[PDB]
Each structure stands twice: as C-alpha cells, then as structure tokens.
Amino acid sequence: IVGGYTCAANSIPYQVSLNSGSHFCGGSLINSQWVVSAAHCYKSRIQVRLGEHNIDVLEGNEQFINAAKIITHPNFNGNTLDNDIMLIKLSSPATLNSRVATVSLPRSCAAAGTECLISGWGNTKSSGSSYPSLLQCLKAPVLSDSSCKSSYPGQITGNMICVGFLEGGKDSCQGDSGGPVVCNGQLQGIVSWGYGCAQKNKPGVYTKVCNYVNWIQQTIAAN
Numbered sequence: 001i002v003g004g005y006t007c008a009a010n011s012i013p014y015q016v017s018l019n020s021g022s023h024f025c026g027g028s029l030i031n032s033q034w035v036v037s038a039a040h041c042y043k044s045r046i047q048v049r050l051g052e053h054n055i056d057v058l059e060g061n062e063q064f065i066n067a068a069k070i071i072t073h074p075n076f077n078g079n080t081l082d083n084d085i086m087l088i089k090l091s092s093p094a095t096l097n098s099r100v101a102t103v104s105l106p107r108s109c110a111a112a113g114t115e116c117l118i119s120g121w122g123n124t125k126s127s128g129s130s131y132p133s134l135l136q137c138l139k140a141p142v143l144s145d146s147s148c149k150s151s152y153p154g155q156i157t158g159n160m161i162c163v164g165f166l167e168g169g170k171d172s173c174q175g176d177s178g179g180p181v182v183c184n185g186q187l188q189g190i191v192s193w194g195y196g197c198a199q200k201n202k203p204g205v206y207t208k209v210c211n212y213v214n215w216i217q218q219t220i221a222a223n
C-alpha cells in the first residue's frame with residue numbers, strides 16, 4: 001500500500017496473510033472456513049495467517065491455518081488476469097473474535113464514488129520497493145468504468161473495477177495482491193493488477209467480486 005497509513009492493530013480483522021515461507025499475498029475471510037484471494041496468488045501449498053498486525057513478530061492473536069483446498073476460477077487467464085479469483089478452504093475453522101472476523105460478500109456492485117478501504121503488507125513505494133512489517137490501510141474510491149477503460153485501453157474486462165486516484169501517489173502494489181477492497185462492509189474488490197504502483201492515470205485494477213458471488217456459493221456447496 002503506497003500513500004496509506006498503518007492500520008490500528010487488528011482493526012481489519014478479515015485481512016489474512018498468505019504465507020509459503022514468507023508473506024506473498026493477501027486475502028479476506030468470508031466465513032469461518034473460507035478465504036477469498038486472487039488466482040494469480042495460487043500456490044499448491046499455502047498457510048493462511050489470521051489475526052496478524054506485525055507479520056514478523058508473534059503478538060498473541062495470530063492463527064496459522066493450512067489451506068486444505070486451494071480453488072482457482074476455472075477460466076482464470078494468467079495473461080489478461082480475467083477471472084482473478086481464488087477460494088481457500090481452511091483445514092480447520094478460524095476462531096472468530098474481535099481480532100479475527102468475517103467480511104460480507106457484496107449485495108450489489110459498488111457505485112462509482114463509493115469509499116473503500118484497501119489493505120495489505122505489500123510494497124509501500126511508488127518507485128523501488130520497501131515492505132512493511134505492520135499492516136497498511138488506504139481509503140480510496142471506486143472509479144467509473146469509463147475512467148478505468150481510459151486509463152487502460154483494451155485491458156479492462158467486465159470482471160474488473162478501478163479503485164483509487166488518477167493523480168498518483170495512493171494505490172495498492174505487489175504483495176497486496178489477493179487482499180481486500182471493502183466498501184460499506186462488503187468485499188467489492190480483490191487486489192489484482194496495475195501499471196506500476198501509484199502512478200498518474202494508472203489506478204489500481206481489482207477483481208469485481210459482485211460478479212462471482214454465485215460461483216462462490218456453488219463452490220462452497222460442492223466442497
């Protein structure tokens with residue numbers, strides 16, 4: 001997260017870190033047994049870390065739970081990043097409390113201008129790279145589909161939304177991938193891609209979660 005601020009500890013209690021030795025992607029806890037992330041974060045083995053603030057230090061509220069199922073959208077395309085969505089089923093249920101809590105799927109797609117909260121442990125620099133120990137947060141608005149397409153001609157499918165700022169300076173970045181865009185208590189976006197990070201007229205591009213809620217319920221029901 002570039003241009004954000006350090007979240008208060010455990011104030012984003014649905015945020016998870018995906019770890020395969022080290023942190024590599026984010027995700028969001030949507031029920032006690034299932035995490036939503038990005039298919040481009042897929043690995044064949046993943047440990048989900050819940051209840052994290054400092055990902056480098058044990059603080060007493062962490063839950064480390066292995067992914068028993070790692071399910072990507074069958075028509076994910078690694079080049080266009082269309083259908084950039086993944087579901088993880090935990091090998092045991094997360095224990096829910098004030099520091100580890102679920103976020104709701106969206107009831108409807110978010111309107112342009114809706115204020116969201118994006119979070120993660122990704123790169124905090126618009127040029128070069130620095131990775132934080134403490135979870136970062138960024139308030140940012142959904143941008144219109146027309147603005148998104150103007151910023152990324154030929155690259156925006158119906159399964160993608162832009163969120164952030166055309167001016168530059170505030171965006172998600174590598175390492176935030178798979179993490180949450182939450183607006184009015186609903187997971188509307190998954191950190192997916194962008195041109196660089198926090199560059200002028202290159203806002204972040206996010207998986208449009210409202211298009212996938214039926215796929216999510218069918219996948220849960222089959223697993």
Ligand SMILES: [Ca+2]
Nearest residue numbers: 054055057058
């Ligand atoms: Ca920790």
